[PDB]
Symmetry: D2
Subunit: 351 residues, 4 copies
Amino acid sequence: GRNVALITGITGQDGSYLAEFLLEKGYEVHGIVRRSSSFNTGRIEHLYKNPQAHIEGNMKLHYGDLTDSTCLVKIINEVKPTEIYNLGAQSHVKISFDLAEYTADVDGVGTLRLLDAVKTCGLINSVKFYQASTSELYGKVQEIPQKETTPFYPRSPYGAAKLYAYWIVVNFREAYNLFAVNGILFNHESPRRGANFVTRKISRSVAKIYLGQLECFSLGNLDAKRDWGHAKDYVEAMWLMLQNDEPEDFVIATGEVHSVREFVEKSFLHIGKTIVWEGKNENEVGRCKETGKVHVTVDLKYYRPTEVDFLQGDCTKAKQKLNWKPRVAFDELVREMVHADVELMRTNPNA
Amino acid sequence: LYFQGRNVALITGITGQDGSYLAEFLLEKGYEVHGIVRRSSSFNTGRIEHLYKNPQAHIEGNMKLHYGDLTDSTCLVKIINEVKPTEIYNLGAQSHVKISFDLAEYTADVDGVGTLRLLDAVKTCGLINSVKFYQASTSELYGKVQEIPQKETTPFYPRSPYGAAKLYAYWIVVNFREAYNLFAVNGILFNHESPRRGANFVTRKISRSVAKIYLGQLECFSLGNLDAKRDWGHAKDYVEAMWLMLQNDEPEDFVIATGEVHSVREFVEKSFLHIGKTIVWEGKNENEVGRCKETGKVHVTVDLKYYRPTEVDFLQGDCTKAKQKLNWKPRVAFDELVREMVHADVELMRTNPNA
Amino acid sequence: GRNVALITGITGQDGSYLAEFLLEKGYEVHGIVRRSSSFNTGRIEHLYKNPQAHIEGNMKLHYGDLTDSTCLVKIINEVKPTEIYNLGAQSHVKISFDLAEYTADVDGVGTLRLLDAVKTCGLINSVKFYQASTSELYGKVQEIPQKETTPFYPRSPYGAAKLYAYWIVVNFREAYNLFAVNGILFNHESPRRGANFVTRKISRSVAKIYLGQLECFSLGNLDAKRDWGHAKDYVEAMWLMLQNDEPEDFVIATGEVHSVREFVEKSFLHIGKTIVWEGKNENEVGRCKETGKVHVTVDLKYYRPTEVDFLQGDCTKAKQKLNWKPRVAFDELVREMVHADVELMRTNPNA
Amino acid sequence: GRNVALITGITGQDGSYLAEFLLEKGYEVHGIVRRSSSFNTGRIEHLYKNPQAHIEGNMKLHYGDLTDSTCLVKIINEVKPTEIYNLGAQSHVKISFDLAEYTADVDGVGTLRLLDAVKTCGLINSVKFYQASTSELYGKVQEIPQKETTPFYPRSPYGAAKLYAYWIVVNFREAYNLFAVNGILFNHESPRRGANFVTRKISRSVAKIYLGQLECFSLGNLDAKRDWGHAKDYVEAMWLMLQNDEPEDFVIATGEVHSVREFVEKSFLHIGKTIVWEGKNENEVGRCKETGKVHVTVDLKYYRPTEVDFLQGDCTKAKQKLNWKPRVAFDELVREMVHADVELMRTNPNA
Ligand SMILES: NC(=O)c1ccc[n+]([C@@H]2O[C@H](COP(=O)([O-])OP(=O)(O)OC[C@H]3O[C@@H](n4cnc5c(N)ncnc54)[C@H](OP(=O)(O)O)[C@@H]3O)[C@@H](O)[C@H]2O)c1
Ligand SMILES: NC(=O)c1ccc[n+]([C@@H]2O[C@H](COP(=O)([O-])OP(=O)(O)OC[C@H]3O[C@@H](n4cnc5c(N)ncnc54)[C@H](OP(=O)(O)O)[C@@H]3O)[C@@H](O)[C@H]2O)c1
Ligand SMILES: NC(=O)c1ccc[n+]([C@@H]2O[C@H](COP(=O)([O-])OP(=O)(O)OC[C@H]3O[C@@H](n4cnc5c(N)ncnc54)[C@H](OP(=O)(O)O)[C@@H]3O)[C@@H](O)[C@H]2O)c1
Ligand SMILES: NC(=O)c1ccc[n+]([C@@H]2O[C@H](COP(=O)([O-])OP(=O)(O)OC[C@H]3O[C@@H](n4cnc5c(N)ncnc54)[C@H](OP(=O)(O)O)[C@@H]3O)[C@@H](O)[C@H]2O)c1
Ligand SMILES: C[C@@H]1O[C@H](OP(=O)(O)OP(=O)(O)OC[C@H]2O[C@@H](n3cnc4c(=O)[nH]c(N)nc43)[C@H](O)[C@@H]2O)[C@@H](O)[C@H](O)[C@@H]1O
Ligand SMILES: C[C@@H]1O[C@H](OP(=O)(O)OP(=O)(O)OC[C@H]2O[C@@H](n3cnc4c(=O)[nH]c(N)nc43)[C@H](O)[C@@H]2O)[C@@H](O)[C@H](O)[C@@H]1O
Ligand SMILES: C[C@@H]1O[C@H](OP(=O)(O)OP(=O)(O)OC[C@H]2O[C@@H](n3cnc4c(=O)[nH]c(N)nc43)[C@H](O)[C@@H]2O)[C@@H](O)[C@H](O)[C@@H]1O
Ligand SMILES: C[C@@H]1O[C@H](OP(=O)(O)OP(=O)(O)OC[C@H]2O[C@@H](n3cnc4c(=O)[nH]c(N)nc43)[C@H](O)[C@@H]2O)[C@@H](O)[C@H](O)[C@@H]1O
Ligand SMILES: Nc1nc2c(ncn2[C@@H]2O[C@H](COP(=O)(O)OP(=O)(O)O)[C@@H](O)[C@H]2O)c(=O)[nH]1
Ligand SMILES: Nc1nc2c(ncn2[C@@H]2O[C@H](COP(=O)(O)OP(=O)(O)O)[C@@H](O)[C@H]2O)c(=O)[nH]1
Ligand SMILES: Nc1nc2c(ncn2[C@@H]2O[C@H](COP(=O)(O)OP(=O)(O)O)[C@@H](O)[C@H]2O)c(=O)[nH]1
Ligand SMILES: Nc1nc2c(ncn2[C@@H]2O[C@H](COP(=O)(O)OP(=O)(O)O)[C@@H](O)[C@H]2O)c(=O)[nH]1
């Protein structure tokens, strides 16, 4: 009956929702946090027993790094987790193009290091292991929609690194009988999403424009199409995969496709502005119909050298085997994110 | 791109305590200031966001940031090649001594090999004769001190994975200077603090905890070795010394310090006096506690988890050489530093009890 | 025009044949050699201009390592090759299970290091890059036979590392227009093959048994089936891929399949011994009919945790587009290897 | 009983002599060997129980690398050594200048990895650890002669990396009470010395000239001065340091200084030739007085950008506490190395 989770990447979007979910289920939750010159725990600070004194209760934190083999062994050996969720990563696709080696060492080799730490600790038989796989693996998609058996075609050093991680997880599963699974999750956003992913960038910018604190912002490829769900729904799927009798990989997604362009339009609609588009390519601009003011421009610096044009997930296997369903759909996702960021910018024009 | 009158700095570790003060110092001298920032799942630029041209939109002016990491050789070459700096300040590091004992390999890779990676990037870009290089060395190099006080010629005796990694960095910097005639210097800076100090260094831990106790947000906090003695100065004074070392006619290494020693115990006592509380110590070793004389409440305890397996008992810097050659003088003394940090953290905690 | 080749892995089996092949065409051939406590250039010492003094002519060696980014940039900037062959790797599958992280750093991240070095030197439009990809990418084969479009399924830390390299190569090709190709070569052997690969282990042991220097040796999985060609034929295909008008990936193979058991049988037949099998699984032994002497046993320490049971390559594409044709078939490969090792072992019983 | 040694760097000069030394004392001796495309065990292949079959007796080898933490932990857990000698290193000073990062990773961080592996394996209080420190730490010497209290002043990426390793060993000793020692050994040579160190380079070249297999060879800085002893004497001091009651660091040296130029002159005298020098700097040549033929030239490519001009060790502490004393002196070392290489080159002009 002992339920002890270890979350790498606990400070990120998904880790903070997953920590809450597992705490709610009575888990003792351990996380690995990077040393940083300022604290990086803002998403999970409310999960201290005393947030004012930063005293831990059932969520306990450990300094560590996915590139330091010894610290991972020490932490796993001390914690003896029953479930490990490897969410730690350099997770940004655009940044990965000029941080390609660091991204490989953390996202790819770092997964190996965590798996070898489990094995070193004698826990291959005692641990269930979740790997944060990603729809970026499909890249230039080879099937539509994409399912567990769709061949991968990565399009960034991030995708390539996660492809390494995916297969080394399969190899520990097959070679050593580790209960280890690849959650092949499609894009998921929330009010806690990193600020330079495209959805949170739009909702942040629309909020600042609404409050008169920003006039305009620049985007990259407006025509990219994504399957977007809500991170809070998706972390439950991660836990469900570790409850399955057999270790299996699952696609987690909504199966509904929308463009970056639509996210922009729906976001502005919630602050009472109708965006109309002018021009083409890097000279395209989005203008408020009601005021005539230009609020969106295009800057090639936000483009990727090898774009991922289209993603649409088929989560049939998860729905059948895990009884999982997405709760939040695209329209509600956009409203929630814009409203959250409006309330945030009201408190702090520098947020 | 290089010409006389064009001053372009590249700061690794720009988001840290020193990097934030040094960015301000160089900006006000009219430098174009570039910084390398780690990718982070939330933003880590809190110390320098006020240096955006537009802090509401986070639009850059004369401070320009770049994603990178000292463990990624290619990214360092790309950034240096793009920026073509005249001055490079390598402040980026896993800088915490206690954490380094259980993060030993990461600390070696960043603080030791990362210095070589940055030096090697300068050479790869063909800029050996175009850049001046500042290395963030440290009084932790003296460790178990072989002389008192410590100066440039005092032999090093490191006492942590942090100290060993910074020792590698110190000497690989000397080697690039001697082998390739790079203008590269080691600033051997003794401890320096500020209201921007990391929260888990001992000074900021005390001022934060005293501030929270003052405000009823905390009743008691634990320290480690109360008897450690340190040479403590102010980070804003010390970043000025980094710049002066790069203005020197020849590349020399310099100790930078106050020369005045105080114990952790004394920092605790002075901090509590600023909120009107006198601490009286009872007990010994891990059972020692500090009690408020006026109220009888125990506010300080000792926890062995904050000890270090190999402590650095005593540090005292002799900066005679820098006083003579750089005309550098510390401005903030220990008493003022304590007052400034307690006062700043009282304000912080009153505004945000979760800070 | 200029023909300047840089070969990583020049001391290995393939590098030694490729160096000879390019030298014959008038290339200046540079190689990267690891620092070793003894010399590791035995396969290429005959290509010094003066072998007694080890003075170089048109083959020029450079100390380096695929894990040292700065050293790779210095070498590429000095050599400015027109053609790069990334053959350097920890290439042994069984050893990769105990050396998983080193294998990842050299075979996967090391390929990224070499590509980034090309880019750092400004040579992205000035060099043609060959990557030593491998039939091990197919692992648990998803199609029979296997061709360029067969979905991958790696089965070792080696396979996973090479799959990262495969895809980071594609990404540099697609992102920066680097002329980069994956040669998907199936198993290829020679008298220069590493001694602990299965074919050379057999030819070496048969040679020692013929000379009375050995009585018996042990293998692992006798039922494994492989597509085996000759390394000298296959390095020609590498060069042809870089002569192609456009950067394409190519399978290189014979399309014929034999078992490890069959390799044993044919090798022993060349020293006039008929191997007859008796027993099953780990107790199976091979006995010489003529003499009744046991010469082959099974030791499970040579098994792999996730075996690759069957490989068979379809090189239709390379035959049509490159006019490549293997000239050495399985039976001639066996004769040649046993013949060469008999001569070697006669000269030196400790070889 | 129980005497189980683990030697990293067992294939090198010192590891080969140390293996024999420990085997004679009845140790079970384990080595870590790097995977290489051809075998790298030539110095130790006579220590197989059956050297023709390469079957192990009391010397047992394990594939590994000082940059792969997991493999280090696995080997130490399996072997459970009582004594660990960390001799593995990129040990060449000139190569370290353009292989600076790899040399840091192996010689510096690799030492921490091996120490951390000892700690991870729970052997911090049972194993005795020998670190292969070096007189290169003294670099630009601050005292003559150099002893334990002489301050370090490294002059290469090799020296800096070894200086990190020196102090991290001290830190594990002081922090965790690990019995760990630094052997501060001055230069030591033998007929097994790496061919591109200056002494073996000379004896190889003089031997070839004696056999009419070579006419001339080039050197670097002829006036460098060194304390040279015999590796076979020095490995005994390593063992003695781990027999000491308390873990202490020791200088090991002969206290006698000779120049590279003297090594040349004495080596040629052993083949009946008197070298007379003419010219300066890179134009200096060494001519046989009896014949007038030039046999030695200077090439700046063998210079180092930061030379270590002079080394002379004072091993008073070791003589008093360990009772160690060198047996082979400079004249005997020169004659031994020339004679061995004459016998070697007789067998093979391409050796
Ligand atoms: N969100 C999606 O749509 C999506 C889809 C599929 C897969 N994924 C993957 O799912 C996981 C979580 O997604 P997220 O959106 O929560 O990403 P995130 O917000 O970027 O969180 C990333 C986490 O990884 C940590 N981390 C980064 N480098 C590390 C290192 N070297 N050692 C240890 N920890 C390190 C970060 O720590 P700091 O806070 O210190 O930076 C943070 O805790 C990631 O692996 C991501 O790649 C995301
Ligand atoms: N303060 C002292 O008393 C003192 C005395 C002597 C020497 N030093 C040295 O002086 C320098 C600055 O001191 P500080 O007090 O400013 O330390 P700090 O506040 O800890 O700042 C450290 C900086 O280094 C960055 N960094 C950490 N790991 C990195 C990596 N892998 N790649 C790139 N950047 C990385 C941090 O970025 P994040 O914000 O992303 O963590 C932060 O910007 C450090 O090198 C420290 O070791 C300090
Ligand atoms: N032979 C096959 O059947 C086959 C099939 C497909 C693909 N491959 C791949 O094709 C390539 C050549 O095959 P091979 O049979 O010639 O392999 P090999 O005989 O094992 O040669 C391997 C080469 O890589 C070098 N190397 C190893 N680690 C290195 C490092 N860290 N930095 C630099 N160089 C390093 C080795 O140098 P040392 O001599 O110093 O070890 C050697 O030169 C390899 O990448 C292999 O994986 C082979
Ligand atoms: N000889 C001297 O005068 C002297 C003086 C003081 C200190 N030292 C140090 O004493 C030790 C032995 O001296 P030596 O002359 O015997 O050096 P050596 O002949 O160069 O032997 C070096 C050994 O280290 C191994 N090695 C290299 N890189 C490795 C890695 N990444 N992982 C694991 N093993 C690796 C080599 O393996 P390969 O065979 O695979 O290359 C070889 O076994 C070295 O640490 C050297 O730096 C030497
Ligand atoms: C290093 C940074 O890279 C960024 O690009 P990068 O992450 O791609 O992110 P962007 O796409 O440029 O902006 C995405 C969102 O992040 C916000 N943002 C950017 N920087 C900061 C910051 O420092 N603090 C806060 N609270 N929000 C920031 C910005 O307002 C926008 O809503 C640049 O916008 C910055 O000027 C800087 O150069
Ligand atoms: C990972 C963290 O390591 C810490 O140890 P560690 O850094 O040595 O730091 P400590 O010496 O325990 O605490 C020093 C100061 O850091 C503050 N602090 C600690 N954690 C946080 C945080 O998450 N956010 C903020 N704003 N302030 C924090 C704490 O209130 C105190 O003023 C533990 O105190 C924490 O509970 C947690 O385990
Ligand atoms: C480290 C070594 O790993 C090996 O396993 P590993 O490579 O899988 O190689 P094996 O499959 O055991 O043997 C394959 C062939 O390599 C030869 N061989 C093995 N070791 C050596 C050697 O040191 N020198 C030479 N010239 N030939 C060697 C062996 O005779 C056989 O023909 C073990 O057989 C050895 O005893 C040792 O443990
Ligand atoms: C990579 C090699 O670097 C070397 O420089 P590097 O190690 O500094 O070594 P050197 O100082 O040039 O030569 C030292 C001794 O090594 C021998 N030697 C050099 N290369 C080899 C080899 O491949 N096999 C054998 N058996 N002996 C070799 C050479 O005869 C001489 O006796 C160059 O001499 C080579 O031409 C090549 O470039
Ligand atoms: N991050 C980001 N993405 C953008 C931007 N403009 C367009 N996009 C596109 O939005 C899509 C989603 O990007 P992102 O939120 O970073 O998540 P990703 O699917 O992992 O790449 C990608 O196709 C981007 O190219 C922008 O300004 N920032
Ligand atoms: N960080 C920290 N240091 C403490 C604590 N208690 C005592 N010290 C001592 O205060 C001295 C200064 O520590 P620190 O502020 O981390 O800076 P350092 O000089 O680089 O080690 C060291 O000797 C510590 O052992 C504590 O709770 N936290
Ligand atoms: N290396 C090796 N392989 C063996 C042995 N016994 C059976 N095999 C099998 O032979 C097949 C070819 O192995 P190998 O020559 O190492 O090349 P690989 O195809 O890259 O794995 C694999 O399926 C091995 O499992 C053995 O003793 N050594
Ligand atoms: N390796 C090497 N060293 C040389 C040569 N010529 C002069 N030397 C000098 O001989 C001294 C000893 O060099 P080496 O044998 O490599 O051992 P080291 O003490 O570790 O540098 C150094 O000062 C070298 O600069 C040469 O051709 N090769």
